[PDB]
Each structure stands twice: as C-alpha cells, then as structure tokens.
C-alpha cells in the first residue's frame, strides 16, 4: 500500500510555501549555519564522545604495554 490521499487524517493546518525560483538556496549559510552546528555538537558530545575517548585511552595504553612487555632487564 501507501499513496497520497490515503495516508492519514489531518485538519485545520495551513502551510505557506514559496517557489524556489523566488528564494535563495543558502539563506544566512554561515550566519545562522555555524551557531546551529555548535548547538548540535553541544547537544550530543556528552553522549557520543565519552565511549570514544575510553577506546582511545585503552588503545594507546594497550599499545604501550605491548611494546614494553617485549624487552627484559634483570633475570
């Protein structure tokens, strides 16, 4: 199934739209653009970053312990 005309029921909502040949494709691209991206980054760092640094630390350590385990001093 599918099809427009049979999706669902909606009432009382107006939608104003504009021809693409009437507006610009990049309104305030950097002006509003960058602030947004920072915001999105902020919104997600605490959830995305922590596991990755946890891997990073385990990666560099695990590497050092490997290299330094293959040498001997006394005994």
């Amino acid at each position: 199934g599918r099809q427009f005309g049979h999706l669902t029921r909606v009432r009382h909502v107006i939608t104003y739209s504009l021809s693409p040949f009437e507006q610009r494709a990049f309104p305030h691209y950097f002006s509003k653009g960058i602030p947004n991206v920072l915001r999105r980054t902020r919104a997600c760092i605490l959830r995305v970053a922590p596991p990755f640094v946890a891997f990073y630390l385990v990666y560099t350590w695990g590497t050092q312990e490997f290299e330094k385990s293959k040498r001997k001093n006394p005994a």
Partner: peptide, 21 residues
Amino acid sequence: YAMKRHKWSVLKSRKLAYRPP
C-alpha cells in the same frame, strides 16, 4: 548541493499555522 538546496528550498522555508475551530 546548490541543485539540492534549490529544490528543498520549498520545504526549508515552509511556514505552518494551526487554526482549530
């Protein structure tokens, strides 16, 4: 990008209004 920007134009600037009775 600009081609895709131009066509999505219509959705990026669409404004909604809800007018219940």
